[PDB]
Write an enzyme that holds these catalytic residues in place. Structure first.
Site, short mmCIF file in Angstrom:
data_model
loop_
_atom_site.label_atom_id
_atom_site.label_comp_id
_atom_site.label_asym_id
_atom_site.label_seq_id
_atom_site.Cartn_x
_atom_site.Cartn_y
_atom_site.Cartn_z
N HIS A 143 3.95 10.78 6.60
CA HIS A 143 3.40 10.44 7.92
C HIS A 143 4.50 9.83 8.76
O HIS A 143 4.94 8.71 8.49
CB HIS A 143 2.22 9.49 7.78
N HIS A 149 0.83 -1.20 0.00
CA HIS A 149 0.00 0.00 0.00
C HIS A 149 0.86 1.26 0.00
O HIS A 149 0.48 2.28 -0.57
CB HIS A 149 -0.98 -0.02 1.17
N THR A 168 -5.44 6.38 8.48
CA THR A 168 -6.08 6.64 7.19
C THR A 168 -6.11 5.41 6.30
O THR A 168 -6.56 5.49 5.16
CB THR A 168 -5.36 7.74 6.42
N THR A 169 -5.59 4.28 6.78
CA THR A 169 -5.78 3.01 6.11
C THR A 169 -6.42 2.04 7.08
O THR A 169 -6.27 2.19 8.30
CB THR A 169 -4.45 2.41 5.63
N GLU A 201 -3.29 13.42 1.65
CA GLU A 201 -4.53 12.95 2.27
C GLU A 201 -5.26 14.11 2.93
O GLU A 201 -6.40 14.42 2.57
CB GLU A 201 -4.25 11.82 3.26
N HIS A 212 6.06 6.79 6.38
CA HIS A 212 5.69 6.39 5.03
C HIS A 212 5.08 7.60 4.36
O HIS A 212 4.87 8.64 5.00
CB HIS A 212 4.65 5.26 5.02
N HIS A 228 2.09 9.02 1.23
CA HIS A 228 0.97 8.83 0.30
C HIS A 228 1.22 9.80 -0.85
O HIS A 228 1.63 10.94 -0.61
CB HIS A 228 -0.34 9.22 1.00
N1 LIG Z 1 -1.67 6.49 7.22
S1 LIG Z 1 -1.52 6.68 8.88
O1 LIG Z 1 -2.92 7.23 9.42
O2 LIG Z 1 -0.25 7.60 9.23
C1 LIG Z 1 -1.20 5.10 9.64
C2 LIG Z 1 -0.31 5.02 10.68
C3 LIG Z 1 -0.06 3.80 11.27
C4 LIG Z 1 -0.72 2.69 10.81
O3 LIG Z 1 -0.46 1.47 11.42
C5 LIG Z 1 -1.62 2.78 9.76
N2 LIG Z 1 -2.34 1.68 9.19
C6 LIG Z 1 -1.72 0.40 8.98
O4 LIG Z 1 -0.60 0.18 9.30
N3 LIG Z 1 -2.55 -0.61 8.37
C7 LIG Z 1 -2.03 -1.93 8.11
C8 LIG Z 1 -1.39 -1.89 6.72
C9 LIG Z 1 -1.34 -0.69 6.02
C10 LIG Z 1 -0.76 -0.67 4.77
N4 LIG Z 1 -0.25 -1.77 4.25
C11 LIG Z 1 -0.28 -2.93 4.89
C12 LIG Z 1 -0.85 -3.03 6.15
C13 LIG Z 1 -1.85 4.00 9.16
ZN LIG Z 2 -0.25 7.49 6.22
#
Ligand SMILES: NS(=O)(=O)c1ccc(O)c(NC(=O)NCc2ccncc2)c1
Ligand SMILES: [Zn+2]
Length: 257
Positions: free
Chosen positions: A116, A61, A195-196, A103, A91, A93
């Site tokens: 992020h 992702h 956000t995921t 986002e 990471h 987006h």
């Molecule tokens: N975008 S965020 O709000 O900074 C954020 C911060 C920490 C997080 O743990 C997540 N969400 C995930 O990690 N979901 C599991 C996953 C996501 C993508 N690919 C494979 C598994 C989103």
């Molecule tokens: Zn993120």
């Protein structure tokens, strides 16, 4: 499973993750004129001098640069936060075009990408416990616009060839996240969610006012990644952003007027 395509993208996520329609979902549009200046907000304290990056991972992702979070090495404190939050990973987006990718939006404006930096509240012992808590995470969000290169991003860009496809990881030590920070730490803050999926409502969002600029070539290299695993049909990892969600009864606070 969930993704960003036509049949599994953000408008579909609520079927597996009903909290997608919850009361504190992220991201949101940051309407800078309705944001409330709060004189009681403390300056952010970003202590990344001792950060220890370990590796970089394509998870299908995005790509995550992961850090040793077994001690208070890279911590975020201050701002709206009570206590100390530890950096676990960052990471991004990004978009298929420079005109989209972030986002959060600012007065409906979309940036080319959004970084992020994910931190967890140390009172919960580890990330897995912290995500189950309403104050478990603090995510520092930084917008990327296309312009001059960001030299501190280049080491990330250069390793992406090693993790083109889902599930690939590479050693990625000695990366200094301070090279990704803009000059000012002025911020907006609001309570929100991942956000995921699983979209958990555990995040204090801290979104910096000042974007960093990255070059067109830097963001193009992001777009050469793949959502798919090796030996599966190639689908470029682009537009891996969730659109803005309703603010509902939340007010965004600003550390600056
Ligand atoms: N975008 S965020 O709000 O900074 C954020 C911060 C920490 C997080 O743990 C997540 N969400 C995930 O990690 N979901 C599991 C996953 C996501 C993508 N690919 C494979 C598994 C989103
Ligand atoms: Zn993120």
């Amino acid at each position: 499973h969930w993704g960003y395509g036509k049949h599994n993208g953000p408008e579909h996520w609520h079927k597996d993750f009903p909290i997608a329609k919850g009361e504190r979902q992220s991201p949101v549009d940051i309407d800078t004129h309705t944001a409330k200046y709060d004189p009681s907000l403390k300056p952010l304290s970003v202590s990344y001098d001792q950060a220890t990056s370990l590796r970089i991972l394509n998870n299908g992702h995005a790509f995550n640069v992961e850090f040793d979070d077994s001690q208070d090495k890279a911590v975020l404190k201050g701002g709206p936060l009570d206590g100390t939050y530890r950096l676990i990973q960052f990471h991004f987006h990004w978009g298929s075009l420079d005109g989209q990718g972030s986002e959060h939006t600012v007065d409906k404006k979309k940036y080319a990408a959004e970084l992020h930096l994910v931190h967890w509240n140390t009172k919960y012992g580890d990330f897995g416990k912290a995500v189950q808590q309403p104050d478990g995470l603090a995510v520092l969000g930084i917008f990327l616009k296309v312009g001059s290169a960001k030299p501190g991003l280049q080491k990330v860009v250069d390793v992406l060839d090693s993790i083109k496809t889902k599930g690939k990881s590479a050693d990625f030590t000695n990366f200094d996240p301070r090279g990704l920070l803009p000059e000012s730490l002025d911020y907006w803050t609001y309570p929100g969610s991942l956000t995921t999926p699983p979209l958990l409502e555990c995040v204090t969002w801290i979104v910096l006012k000042e974007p960093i600029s990255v070059s067109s070539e830097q963001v193009l290299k992001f777009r050469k990644l793949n959502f798919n695993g090796e030996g599966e049909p190639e689908e470029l990892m682009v537009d891996n952003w969730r659109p803005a969600q309703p603010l509902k009864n939340r007010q965004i606070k600003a550390s600056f007027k």
